[PDB]
Amino acid sequence: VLERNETMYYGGSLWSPPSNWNPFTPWNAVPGTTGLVYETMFFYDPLTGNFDPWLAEKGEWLDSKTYRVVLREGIYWHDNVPLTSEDVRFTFEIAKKYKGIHYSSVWEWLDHIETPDNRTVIFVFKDPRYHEWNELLYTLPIVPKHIWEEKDETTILQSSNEYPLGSGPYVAHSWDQNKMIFERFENWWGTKVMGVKPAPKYVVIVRVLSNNVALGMLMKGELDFSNFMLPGVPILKKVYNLNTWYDEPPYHLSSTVVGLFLNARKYPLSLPEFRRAIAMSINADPIVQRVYEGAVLKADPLGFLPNSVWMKYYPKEVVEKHGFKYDPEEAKSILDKLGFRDVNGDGFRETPDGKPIKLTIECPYGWTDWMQAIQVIVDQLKVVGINAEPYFPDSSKYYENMYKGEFDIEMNANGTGISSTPWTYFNTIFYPDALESEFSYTGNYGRYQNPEVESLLEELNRTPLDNVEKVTELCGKLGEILLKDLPFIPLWYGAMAFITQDNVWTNWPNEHNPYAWPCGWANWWQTGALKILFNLKPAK
Ligand SMILES: OC[C@H]1O[C@@H](O[C@H]2[C@H](O)[C@H](O)[C@H](O[C@H]3[C@H](O)[C@H](O)[C@H](O[C@H]4[C@H](O)[C@H](O)[C@H](O[C@H]5[C@H](O)[C@H](O)[C@@H](O[C@H]6[C@H](O)[C@H](O)[C@@H](O)O[C@@H]6CO)O[C@@H]5CO)O[C@@H]4CO)O[C@@H]3CO)O[C@@H]2CO)[C@@H](O)[C@@H](O)[C@@H]1O
Ligand SMILES: [Mg+2]
């Protein structure tokens, strides 16, 4: 039983029973495990693009192939063991020893690590992949050598890591099927050194069956910090005093690229020209206008987030010449040309060989906005003679399907989140290593194959970010492939849905006090939601 006034209720990113706290398995780890319990070398702030020293006191390129971080002094694990450069060293090297660890690939371009003292980590690279390194700096959680030292690979990969031993502001406290509770670690080093202190003694991650349940909670004042997508925002504000980031439409910040992955290995979705017909048959205007009531922004064909630093590298002419539009008559014309015609007379087009075509289109149950969006896509596909069947599995099955590539059509925003480089977006789309993976956690979920994308991805990755002309050119070349082969169809920019109320906690960020990115998704707490905790004030 938790004291209400000492407790902040968060919801929006827990859609399965909390059952994993393993920093090595971020796809299964309960939201907050990284960020609240395990710490990263840097914070990252999507509002500004700034990296802010967390564990790292500083991080610099000494030269084009050498990166050095100097840790802050006085960092400790929760069990009072000093956190040192060897902890950081270990974090990387355990993956060279055990290649099954998802980030073992870094050693294909990381040559070795030096630690001239216990605060200093020096990375020397065989092949410096800058864009990817930048992201590692704020996404790779640092783990305790003295805890994991003598575990084998199966233990590391398969353990649940209950009551994870970290260095961060919180510990795991308790949980059940419907919530995860974090309790503030009072002797946190972060407070002694950085002078910050997360205001709630307890953070509860609330799991809910569907978005509609969360709204009732908010109206009852039982959620404080909500990332659920909820309708009727003007009314929520006026009638129920629930607040959003912006006072006016679109009300929410934009955080992701929402679109459709297609199974590139299942006929007829294996056909580029069929994928194109699908893209041209979909009109997002009623999704944007009616499902979201103007609370999201519609995507252009390339799908670069308008509020992101990717725009700095926008390949404008490529999009103009190769982008698609909603054009259902041309979609039908393409389908006729390919031989996809109705031969039994039920209004659906068959294969040229005369065989029926039925494609499932799926999203998680309870994501009410995507379920509605999926049905308008279904109705829009029906009208060009394409039989799409909506399917809303449990979130856990939705993600298993995604990783395994066991889907026909799939609504997706997994890895397309805002970032410091358009490389994340293209990697999520094209991720070549998916073709030789049972489980693809990184992207390319529909197993799209292309002989030139891997080289393009790498060339982009090793191009210094300040080389605008070259990064732009490479985004152009990659965008050109995306636009012509459409393995992923961008539709709109997902809202960073963020609704709060002030009955228990106040001083939330918004457009008038825009101090932190409000995202409590797994792996996102170090992008701002932790900083919000630092800044919250109890209500009077
Ligand atoms: O509106 C619908 C519905 O929305 C809900 O809110 C959703 C929202 O819609 C999104 O769907 C969101 O999705 C999140 C997701 O929950 C999770 O937080 C996700 O984390 C990403 C990271 O952002 C990052 O991209 C990460 O990439 C890693 C990768 O997966 C590998 O693990 C890792 O290993 C690499 C290695 O480092 C090498 O660099 C590389 O070459 O290969 C290795 C492995 O091959 O590499 C990176 C670094 O770790 O992946 C994770 C997991 O994908 O981010 C997405 C957003 O992009 O979820 C929200 C919460 O559910 C709610 O609002 C509903 O109410 C609403 O109805
Ligand atoms: Mg037919």
Coordinates of C-alpha atoms and ligand atoms in Angstrom, one line a residue:
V1 CA 0.0 0.0 0.0
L2 CA 1.6 3.3 -1.2
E3 CA 1.2 6.8 0.0
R4 CA -0.7 8.7 -2.7
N5 CA 1.2 12.0 -2.2
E6 CA 4.6 10.3 -2.4
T7 CA 3.6 8.3 -5.5
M8 CA 3.5 9.2 -9.2
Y9 CA 1.3 7.0 -11.4
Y10 CA 2.6 6.7 -15.0
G11 CA 0.9 4.8 -17.8
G12 CA 1.2 4.2 -21.6
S13 CA 4.0 1.8 -22.3
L14 CA 3.3 -1.4 -20.3
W15 CA 1.1 -3.7 -22.3
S16 CA 2.2 -7.1 -20.9
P17 CA 2.7 -8.5 -17.4
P18 CA 6.0 -7.2 -16.0
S19 CA 8.3 -10.2 -16.2
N20 CA 11.8 -9.1 -17.2
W21 CA 14.3 -6.5 -15.9
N22 CA 17.3 -7.7 -18.0
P23 CA 19.4 -4.8 -19.3
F24 CA 20.7 -7.2 -22.0
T25 CA 17.2 -7.8 -23.4
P26 CA 15.7 -4.3 -23.9
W27 CA 12.8 -5.7 -25.9
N28 CA 11.4 -7.5 -22.9
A29 CA 12.6 -5.2 -20.1
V30 CA 9.9 -3.4 -18.1
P31 CA 9.7 0.4 -18.8
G32 CA 12.1 2.3 -16.5
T33 CA 14.5 -0.6 -15.9
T34 CA 16.9 1.3 -18.1
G35 CA 16.8 5.0 -17.0
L36 CA 15.4 4.5 -13.5
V37 CA 17.6 1.6 -12.4
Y38 CA 20.4 1.3 -15.0
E39 CA 22.1 4.5 -16.1
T40 CA 23.6 5.6 -19.4
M41 CA 26.8 7.6 -20.1
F42 CA 24.7 10.5 -21.5
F43 CA 21.2 11.9 -21.4
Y44 CA 19.8 13.0 -24.8
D45 CA 17.3 15.8 -25.3
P46 CA 15.1 15.6 -28.5
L47 CA 13.9 19.1 -27.8
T48 CA 17.3 20.6 -28.5
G49 CA 19.5 17.8 -29.7
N50 CA 21.8 18.3 -26.7
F51 CA 23.8 15.5 -25.0
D52 CA 24.0 16.0 -21.3
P53 CA 26.7 14.2 -19.2
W54 CA 25.2 11.6 -16.9
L55 CA 27.7 8.9 -15.9
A56 CA 30.2 10.5 -18.3
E57 CA 31.5 13.8 -17.1
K58 CA 32.7 14.4 -20.7
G59 CA 33.0 12.6 -24.0
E60 CA 35.2 13.7 -26.9
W61 CA 36.7 12.5 -30.1
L62 CA 40.4 12.8 -29.6
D63 CA 40.8 12.1 -33.3
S64 CA 38.8 10.6 -36.1
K65 CA 39.2 7.1 -34.7
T66 CA 39.5 7.6 -30.9
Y67 CA 36.7 8.5 -28.4
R68 CA 37.4 9.1 -24.8
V69 CA 34.9 9.4 -21.9
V70 CA 35.9 10.5 -18.5
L71 CA 33.5 9.3 -15.8
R72 CA 32.3 11.6 -13.1
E73 CA 33.9 11.0 -9.7
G74 CA 31.9 9.4 -6.9
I75 CA 29.5 7.2 -8.9
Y76 CA 28.4 4.1 -6.9
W77 CA 26.3 1.0 -7.5
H78 CA 23.4 0.5 -5.2
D79 CA 25.4 -2.1 -3.2
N80 CA 28.1 0.6 -2.6
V81 CA 30.6 -0.9 -5.0
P82 CA 32.3 2.0 -6.9
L83 CA 31.2 2.4 -10.5
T84 CA 34.4 2.7 -12.6
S85 CA 35.9 2.6 -16.0
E86 CA 36.2 -1.2 -15.8
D87 CA 32.3 -1.4 -15.4
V88 CA 32.1 0.5 -18.7
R89 CA 34.9 -1.6 -20.2
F90 CA 33.0 -4.8 -19.1
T91 CA 29.7 -3.5 -20.5
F92 CA 31.2 -3.6 -24.0
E93 CA 33.6 -6.6 -23.7
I94 CA 31.1 -9.1 -22.4
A95 CA 29.6 -8.9 -25.9
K96 CA 32.9 -9.7 -27.6
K97 CA 33.1 -12.8 -25.4
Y98 CA 29.4 -13.7 -25.8
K99 CA 28.4 -12.9 -29.4
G100 CA 24.7 -13.6 -28.7
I101 CA 24.4 -10.3 -26.8
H102 CA 22.5 -8.0 -29.2
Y103 CA 25.3 -5.4 -29.4
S104 CA 28.2 -7.8 -30.1
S105 CA 28.2 -6.3 -33.7
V106 CA 30.0 -3.2 -32.4
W107 CA 33.2 -5.2 -32.2
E108 CA 33.1 -5.3 -36.0
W109 CA 34.2 -1.7 -35.9
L110 CA 35.4 -1.2 -32.3
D111 CA 39.0 -2.4 -32.1
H112 CA 39.7 -2.2 -28.4
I113 CA 39.2 -0.3 -25.2
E114 CA 41.8 1.3 -22.9
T115 CA 41.4 2.3 -19.2
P116 CA 44.4 4.4 -18.1
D117 CA 42.7 5.0 -14.7
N118 CA 39.4 4.2 -13.0
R119 CA 37.5 7.2 -14.4
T120 CA 38.8 7.1 -18.0
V121 CA 37.5 4.9 -20.9
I122 CA 39.2 5.2 -24.3
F123 CA 37.6 3.6 -27.3
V124 CA 39.8 3.0 -30.3
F125 CA 37.9 2.1 -33.5
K126 CA 38.9 0.0 -36.5
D127 CA 36.0 1.7 -38.4
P128 CA 34.3 4.6 -36.6
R129 CA 30.6 4.6 -37.2
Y130 CA 29.7 8.0 -35.9
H131 CA 25.9 8.1 -36.2
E132 CA 25.5 4.8 -34.4
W133 CA 28.1 5.7 -31.8
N134 CA 26.2 8.9 -30.9
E135 CA 23.1 6.8 -30.2
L136 CA 25.0 4.2 -28.1
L137 CA 26.2 7.1 -25.8
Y138 CA 22.7 7.5 -24.5
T139 CA 21.0 4.2 -25.1
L140 CA 23.6 1.6 -23.9
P141 CA 23.0 1.0 -20.1
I142 CA 26.1 0.4 -18.0
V143 CA 26.1 -2.8 -16.1
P144 CA 28.0 -4.0 -12.9
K145 CA 31.0 -6.1 -13.8
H146 CA 31.0 -7.6 -10.2
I147 CA 27.5 -8.8 -10.8
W148 CA 27.7 -10.3 -14.3
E149 CA 31.4 -11.3 -14.3
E150 CA 31.0 -15.0 -13.9
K151 CA 27.6 -15.7 -15.6
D152 CA 27.5 -17.7 -18.8
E153 CA 25.8 -16.6 -22.0
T154 CA 22.6 -18.5 -21.4
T155 CA 22.2 -17.0 -17.9
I156 CA 22.8 -13.5 -19.3
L157 CA 20.4 -13.9 -22.3
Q158 CA 17.6 -15.8 -20.4
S159 CA 17.6 -14.4 -16.9
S160 CA 14.7 -12.2 -15.7
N161 CA 17.1 -10.2 -13.5
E162 CA 14.5 -9.6 -10.7
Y163 CA 15.4 -6.8 -8.4
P164 CA 18.1 -5.5 -10.9
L165 CA 21.3 -4.2 -9.2
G166 CA 22.0 -0.8 -10.8
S167 CA 23.4 2.6 -10.1
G168 CA 20.3 4.8 -10.9
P169 CA 17.8 6.9 -8.9
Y170 CA 15.4 4.0 -8.3
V171 CA 15.2 0.3 -7.4
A172 CA 12.7 -2.3 -8.3
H173 CA 10.3 -2.4 -5.3
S174 CA 7.3 -4.7 -6.2
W175 CA 5.0 -5.7 -9.1
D176 CA 2.1 -7.8 -10.3
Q177 CA 0.2 -8.5 -13.5
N178 CA -1.0 -5.0 -13.7
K179 CA 1.8 -2.7 -12.4
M180 CA 5.5 -2.2 -11.8
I181 CA 6.6 -0.2 -8.7
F182 CA 9.9 1.6 -8.4
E183 CA 11.1 2.9 -5.1
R184 CA 13.5 5.9 -4.9
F185 CA 17.1 4.8 -3.9
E186 CA 17.8 7.4 -1.2
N187 CA 21.6 7.1 -1.3
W188 CA 21.8 7.7 -5.0
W189 CA 25.1 9.1 -6.1
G190 CA 23.4 11.3 -8.6
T191 CA 21.9 13.5 -5.9
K192 CA 25.2 14.0 -4.2
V193 CA 27.1 14.8 -7.3
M194 CA 24.6 16.4 -9.7
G195 CA 22.3 17.8 -7.1
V196 CA 19.1 16.4 -8.6
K197 CA 16.5 14.4 -6.8
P198 CA 13.5 12.7 -8.4
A199 CA 10.4 14.0 -6.4
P200 CA 8.2 10.9 -6.2
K201 CA 9.3 8.4 -3.6
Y202 CA 7.4 5.8 -5.7
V203 CA 7.0 5.6 -9.5
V204 CA 4.3 3.2 -10.6
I205 CA 4.1 2.0 -14.2
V206 CA 0.4 1.2 -14.7
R207 CA -0.7 -1.5 -17.2
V208 CA -4.1 -1.1 -18.6
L209 CA -6.2 -3.2 -21.0
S210 CA -6.9 -0.4 -23.5
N211 CA -6.7 3.4 -23.9
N212 CA -10.3 3.8 -22.8
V213 CA -9.5 2.5 -19.3
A214 CA -6.7 5.0 -18.9
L215 CA -9.0 7.9 -19.6
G216 CA -11.3 7.0 -16.7
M217 CA -8.3 6.8 -14.5
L218 CA -7.2 10.2 -15.5
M219 CA -10.6 11.7 -14.9
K220 CA -10.6 10.1 -11.4
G221 CA -7.1 11.5 -10.8
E222 CA -5.6 8.0 -10.6
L223 CA -3.0 8.6 -13.3
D224 CA -0.5 11.5 -13.1
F225 CA 1.6 11.1 -16.2
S226 CA 0.0 9.6 -19.2
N227 CA 1.4 8.6 -22.6
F228 CA -1.8 6.9 -23.7
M229 CA -3.4 8.2 -26.9
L230 CA -6.7 9.6 -25.8
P231 CA -9.4 11.4 -27.9
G232 CA -11.4 14.6 -27.2
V233 CA -8.4 16.7 -26.1
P234 CA -10.1 20.1 -26.2
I235 CA -12.9 18.6 -24.0
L236 CA -10.4 16.8 -21.7
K237 CA -8.8 20.3 -21.1
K238 CA -12.0 22.3 -20.6
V239 CA -14.2 19.8 -18.8
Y240 CA -11.7 17.7 -16.9
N241 CA -8.7 20.1 -16.5
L242 CA -6.3 17.6 -18.1
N243 CA -3.3 19.3 -19.7
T244 CA -1.3 18.7 -22.9
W245 CA 2.0 20.1 -24.2
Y246 CA 0.4 22.6 -26.7
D247 CA -2.7 24.7 -25.9
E248 CA -3.8 24.4 -29.5
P249 CA -3.7 21.7 -32.2
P250 CA -2.0 19.4 -32.6
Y251 CA -1.8 19.4 -28.8
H252 CA 1.1 16.8 -28.7
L253 CA 4.7 16.8 -29.8
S254 CA 5.5 14.4 -32.6
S255 CA 7.7 11.4 -31.7
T256 CA 7.5 8.6 -34.3
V257 CA 6.9 7.7 -37.9
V258 CA 3.8 5.6 -38.1
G259 CA 3.4 3.3 -41.1
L260 CA 3.1 -0.2 -42.5
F261 CA 5.7 -2.9 -42.8
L262 CA 4.9 -5.4 -45.5
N263 CA 6.0 -9.0 -45.6
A264 CA 8.5 -8.8 -48.5
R265 CA 8.8 -12.6 -48.6
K266 CA 5.1 -13.4 -49.0
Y267 CA 3.4 -13.2 -52.4
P268 CA 2.0 -10.9 -53.6
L269 CA 3.4 -8.4 -51.0
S270 CA 6.8 -9.6 -52.3
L271 CA 6.1 -7.6 -55.4
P272 CA 7.3 -3.9 -55.3
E273 CA 4.6 -2.9 -57.7
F274 CA 1.9 -4.5 -55.5
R275 CA 3.3 -2.7 -52.4
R276 CA 3.1 0.5 -54.4
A277 CA -0.6 -0.1 -55.3
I278 CA -1.2 -0.5 -51.6
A279 CA 0.6 2.8 -50.8
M280 CA -1.4 4.6 -53.5
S281 CA -4.7 3.2 -52.2
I282 CA -4.4 4.7 -48.7
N283 CA -5.5 8.2 -47.8
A284 CA -4.3 9.2 -44.3
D285 CA -6.4 12.5 -44.4
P286 CA -9.4 10.8 -42.6
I287 CA -7.0 9.1 -40.2
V288 CA -5.3 12.4 -39.3
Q289 CA -8.6 14.4 -39.3
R290 CA -11.1 12.0 -37.8
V291 CA -9.3 9.2 -35.9
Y292 CA -6.9 11.8 -34.4
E293 CA -9.0 15.0 -34.6
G294 CA -6.0 16.9 -35.9
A295 CA -3.7 15.7 -33.1
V296 CA -1.1 14.3 -35.5
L297 CA 0.6 15.4 -38.6
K298 CA 0.3 13.6 -41.9
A299 CA 3.5 12.2 -43.4
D300 CA 5.1 12.9 -46.8
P301 CA 6.3 9.9 -48.8
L302 CA 9.8 9.8 -47.2
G303 CA 8.5 10.1 -43.7
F304 CA 11.2 12.3 -42.1
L305 CA 9.9 13.7 -38.8
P306 CA 9.3 17.4 -39.4
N307 CA 10.5 18.4 -35.9
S308 CA 13.7 16.3 -36.1
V309 CA 17.3 16.9 -37.1
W310 CA 16.8 14.5 -40.0
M311 CA 15.3 17.6 -41.8
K312 CA 18.7 19.0 -41.9
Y313 CA 19.5 16.2 -44.4
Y314 CA 16.1 16.1 -46.2
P315 CA 16.7 15.0 -49.8
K316 CA 14.0 17.2 -51.3
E317 CA 14.3 16.5 -55.0
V318 CA 14.5 12.8 -54.5
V319 CA 11.1 12.9 -52.7
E320 CA 9.6 15.2 -55.3
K321 CA 10.5 12.9 -58.2
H322 CA 10.0 9.4 -56.6
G323 CA 7.3 9.9 -53.9
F324 CA 3.9 8.4 -54.0
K325 CA 0.4 9.9 -53.5
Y326 CA -3.1 8.8 -52.8
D327 CA -4.3 7.8 -56.3
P328 CA -6.7 4.9 -56.2
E329 CA -7.4 4.9 -60.0
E330 CA -3.7 4.6 -60.7
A331 CA -3.5 1.8 -58.1
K332 CA -6.2 -0.1 -60.0
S333 CA -4.4 0.6 -63.2
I334 CA -1.2 -0.9 -61.8
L335 CA -3.1 -4.0 -60.5
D336 CA -4.8 -4.5 -63.9
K337 CA -1.4 -4.3 -65.6
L338 CA 0.1 -6.9 -63.2
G339 CA -2.8 -9.3 -63.9
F340 CA -4.5 -8.9 -60.5
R341 CA -8.1 -9.1 -61.5
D342 CA -11.4 -10.2 -59.9
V343 CA -12.4 -13.5 -61.6
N344 CA -15.0 -14.9 -59.2
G345 CA -16.8 -11.6 -59.1
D346 CA -16.6 -10.9 -55.3
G347 CA -15.0 -7.5 -55.9
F348 CA -11.6 -8.7 -54.6
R349 CA -8.7 -9.1 -57.1
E350 CA -7.1 -12.5 -57.4
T351 CA -3.6 -13.5 -58.3
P352 CA -2.8 -13.8 -62.0
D353 CA -3.0 -17.5 -61.5
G354 CA -6.5 -17.0 -60.3
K355 CA -5.8 -17.6 -56.6
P356 CA -7.5 -15.6 -53.8
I357 CA -5.6 -12.9 -51.9
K358 CA -6.3 -12.2 -48.3
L359 CA -3.8 -10.1 -46.3
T360 CA -4.1 -9.7 -42.5
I361 CA -3.4 -6.2 -41.2
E362 CA -2.5 -6.0 -37.5
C363 CA -1.8 -3.8 -34.4
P364 CA -2.0 -4.5 -30.7
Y365 CA -5.5 -4.8 -29.1
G366 CA -6.3 -1.8 -27.0
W367 CA -4.4 0.7 -29.1
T368 CA -7.7 2.2 -30.0
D369 CA -6.4 4.8 -32.4
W370 CA -4.4 2.2 -34.5
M371 CA -7.4 -0.2 -34.5
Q372 CA -9.6 2.6 -35.9
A373 CA -6.8 3.5 -38.4
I374 CA -6.5 -0.1 -39.4
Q375 CA -10.2 -0.3 -40.3
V376 CA -10.1 2.8 -42.5
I377 CA -7.2 1.3 -44.3
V378 CA -9.2 -1.9 -44.7
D379 CA -12.2 0.0 -46.1
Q380 CA -9.8 1.9 -48.4
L381 CA -8.2 -1.3 -49.6
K382 CA -11.6 -2.8 -50.2
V383 CA -12.4 -0.2 -52.7
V384 CA -9.4 -1.0 -54.9
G385 CA -10.2 -4.7 -54.7
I386 CA -7.7 -5.7 -52.0
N387 CA -9.0 -8.0 -49.2
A388 CA -7.5 -6.9 -45.9
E389 CA -8.5 -8.5 -42.6
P390 CA -8.0 -6.5 -39.4
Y391 CA -6.4 -8.4 -36.5
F392 CA -5.8 -7.1 -33.0
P393 CA -3.7 -9.6 -31.1
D394 CA -2.4 -9.0 -27.5
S395 CA 0.6 -6.7 -27.6
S396 CA 3.0 -9.5 -26.6
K397 CA 1.9 -11.5 -29.7
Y398 CA 2.0 -8.4 -31.9
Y399 CA 5.6 -8.0 -31.0
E400 CA 6.5 -11.7 -31.4
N401 CA 4.9 -11.5 -34.9
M402 CA 7.0 -8.4 -35.6
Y403 CA 10.3 -9.9 -34.6
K404 CA 9.6 -13.2 -36.3
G405 CA 8.2 -11.5 -39.4
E406 CA 5.0 -13.6 -39.0
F407 CA 2.6 -11.0 -40.4
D408 CA 1.1 -9.9 -43.7
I409 CA 0.6 -6.2 -43.2
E410 CA 1.5 -4.5 -39.9
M411 CA 1.1 -1.0 -38.5
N412 CA 4.4 -0.1 -36.9
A413 CA 6.4 2.7 -35.2
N414 CA 9.0 0.5 -33.5
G415 CA 12.4 2.1 -34.0
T416 CA 11.2 5.1 -36.0
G417 CA 11.3 7.4 -32.9
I418 CA 13.0 10.8 -33.1
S419 CA 16.8 10.6 -32.9
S420 CA 20.1 12.4 -33.5
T421 CA 20.4 11.0 -37.0
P422 CA 18.3 9.8 -39.9
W423 CA 20.4 6.7 -39.8
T424 CA 18.2 5.3 -37.1
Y425 CA 15.2 5.6 -39.3
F426 CA 16.8 3.9 -42.3
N427 CA 18.3 1.2 -40.2
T428 CA 14.9 0.4 -38.7
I429 CA 13.6 0.1 -42.2
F430 CA 16.4 -1.6 -44.1
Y431 CA 18.2 -3.6 -41.3
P432 CA 19.9 -6.2 -43.5
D433 CA 20.7 -8.6 -40.7
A434 CA 17.0 -9.4 -40.3
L435 CA 17.3 -11.8 -43.3
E436 CA 19.5 -14.1 -41.2
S437 CA 17.7 -13.7 -37.9
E438 CA 14.8 -15.7 -36.4
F439 CA 14.2 -12.7 -34.2
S440 CA 14.8 -9.2 -35.7
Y441 CA 14.6 -6.7 -32.8
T442 CA 16.2 -3.9 -34.7
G443 CA 14.0 -3.6 -37.8
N444 CA 13.3 -4.7 -41.4
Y445 CA 10.7 -6.9 -39.9
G446 CA 9.2 -7.9 -43.2
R447 CA 12.6 -9.2 -44.3
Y448 CA 13.1 -6.9 -47.3
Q449 CA 16.3 -7.8 -49.3
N450 CA 18.4 -5.3 -51.3
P451 CA 22.0 -5.7 -52.4
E452 CA 22.9 -2.0 -52.1
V453 CA 21.2 -0.8 -48.9
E454 CA 23.8 -2.3 -46.4
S455 CA 26.7 -0.5 -48.1
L456 CA 24.6 2.7 -48.2
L457 CA 23.7 2.4 -44.5
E458 CA 27.3 1.9 -43.5
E459 CA 28.6 4.7 -45.7
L460 CA 26.0 7.0 -44.1
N461 CA 27.0 5.7 -40.6
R462 CA 30.7 6.5 -41.0
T463 CA 30.0 9.9 -42.5
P464 CA 30.6 12.7 -39.9
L465 CA 27.3 14.4 -39.1
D466 CA 28.5 17.8 -40.0
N467 CA 29.1 16.7 -43.5
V468 CA 25.7 17.9 -44.6
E469 CA 26.2 17.5 -48.3
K470 CA 27.3 13.9 -48.0
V471 CA 24.8 12.8 -45.4
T472 CA 22.1 14.4 -47.5
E473 CA 23.3 12.6 -50.6
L474 CA 23.2 9.3 -48.8
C475 CA 19.8 9.9 -47.3
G476 CA 18.8 10.6 -50.9
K477 CA 20.1 7.3 -52.2
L478 CA 18.5 5.4 -49.3
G479 CA 15.3 7.4 -49.6
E480 CA 15.3 6.6 -53.3
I481 CA 15.2 2.9 -52.6
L482 CA 12.6 3.2 -49.9
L483 CA 10.4 5.2 -52.2
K484 CA 10.7 2.9 -55.2
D485 CA 10.5 -0.5 -53.3
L486 CA 8.3 0.6 -50.4
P487 CA 9.2 -2.1 -47.8
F488 CA 7.8 0.4 -45.3
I489 CA 4.9 2.8 -46.1
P490 CA 5.0 6.0 -43.9
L491 CA 1.5 7.4 -43.2
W492 CA 1.7 9.9 -40.3
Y493 CA 3.8 11.1 -37.5
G494 CA 2.8 9.6 -34.2
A495 CA 1.9 11.9 -31.4
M496 CA 4.1 12.0 -28.3
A497 CA 0.8 11.7 -26.4
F498 CA 1.3 13.4 -23.0
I499 CA -1.5 14.3 -20.7
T500 CA -1.3 15.3 -17.0
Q501 CA -3.3 16.6 -14.1
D502 CA -2.1 18.6 -11.0
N503 CA -4.0 17.1 -8.1
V504 CA -0.9 15.4 -6.7
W505 CA 2.1 16.6 -8.8
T506 CA 2.7 19.9 -10.6
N507 CA 5.3 21.7 -12.7
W508 CA 5.0 19.4 -15.6
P509 CA 6.6 20.6 -18.8
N510 CA 4.6 22.1 -21.6
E511 CA 5.0 24.6 -24.5
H512 CA 5.3 27.5 -22.0
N513 CA 7.8 25.6 -19.8
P514 CA 9.4 23.2 -22.4
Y515 CA 12.2 21.8 -20.2
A516 CA 12.0 18.0 -20.9
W517 CA 10.8 15.5 -23.5
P518 CA 7.8 13.7 -21.8
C519 CA 8.4 10.0 -22.8
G520 CA 8.1 7.1 -20.5
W521 CA 8.5 4.3 -23.1
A522 CA 11.0 1.6 -22.4
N523 CA 14.5 2.9 -23.3
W524 CA 13.3 6.5 -23.4
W525 CA 13.4 7.7 -19.7
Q526 CA 16.9 9.1 -20.2
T527 CA 15.5 11.4 -23.0
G528 CA 13.5 13.5 -20.5
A529 CA 10.9 11.7 -18.3
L530 CA 13.6 11.2 -15.6
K531 CA 14.4 15.0 -15.8
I532 CA 10.6 15.6 -15.3
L533 CA 10.8 13.6 -12.0
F534 CA 13.7 15.9 -10.9
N535 CA 11.4 18.9 -11.5
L536 CA 8.1 17.9 -10.1
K537 CA 6.6 19.7 -7.1
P538 CA 4.0 18.3 -4.7
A539 CA 0.6 19.9 -5.1
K540 CA -0.6 22.2 -2.3
Ligands
LIG1 O1 -0.7 5.2 -30.9 C1 -0.6 3.8 -30.8 C2 -0.4 3.5 -29.3 O2 0.9 4.1 -29.0 C3 1.4 3.7 -27.7 O3 2.7 4.3 -27.5 C4 3.6 3.5 -28.2 C5 4.1 4.1 -29.5 O4 3.0 4.1 -30.5 C6 5.3 3.4 -30.1 O5 4.9 2.2 -30.8 C7 6.3 3.1 -29.0 O6 7.4 2.3 -29.6 C8 8.6 2.5 -28.9 C9 8.9 1.2 -28.1 O7 8.0 1.0 -27.1 C10 10.3 1.2 -27.6 O8 10.4 2.2 -26.6 C11 11.3 1.5 -28.7 O9 12.6 1.4 -28.2 C12 13.6 1.2 -29.3 C13 14.7 2.3 -29.3 O10 14.1 3.5 -29.4 C14 15.8 2.0 -30.2 O11 15.4 2.3 -31.6 C15 16.3 0.5 -30.1 O12 17.3 0.2 -31.1 C16 18.2 -0.7 -30.6 C17 17.9 -2.1 -31.3 O13 16.6 -2.5 -31.1 C18 18.9 -3.2 -30.8 O14 18.4 -3.7 -29.7 C19 20.3 -2.6 -30.6 O15 21.3 -3.6 -30.8 C20 22.0 -3.2 -32.0 C21 23.4 -2.7 -31.8 O16 23.4 -1.6 -30.9 C22 23.9 -2.3 -33.2 O17 24.0 -0.9 -33.2 C23 23.0 -2.7 -34.4 O18 23.7 -2.6 -35.6 O19 22.4 -4.0 -34.3 C24 22.2 -4.5 -32.9 C25 21.0 -5.5 -32.9 O20 20.8 -5.9 -34.2 O21 20.5 -1.4 -31.3 C26 19.6 -0.3 -30.8 C27 20.3 0.4 -29.6 O22 19.9 -0.3 -28.4 O23 15.2 -0.4 -30.2 C28 14.2 -0.2 -29.2 C29 13.2 -1.3 -29.4 O24 12.8 -1.3 -30.7 O25 11.0 2.7 -29.3 C30 9.7 2.7 -30.0 C31 9.5 4.0 -30.7 O26 10.4 4.1 -31.8 O27 5.7 2.4 -28.0 C32 4.9 3.3 -27.2 C33 4.6 2.6 -25.9 O28 3.8 1.4 -26.1 C34 0.4 4.3 -26.6 O29 0.4 5.7 -26.6 C35 -1.0 3.8 -26.9 O30 -1.9 4.5 -26.0 C36 -1.4 4.2 -28.4 O31 -2.7 3.7 -28.7
MG2 MG -12.6 -12.1 -56.5

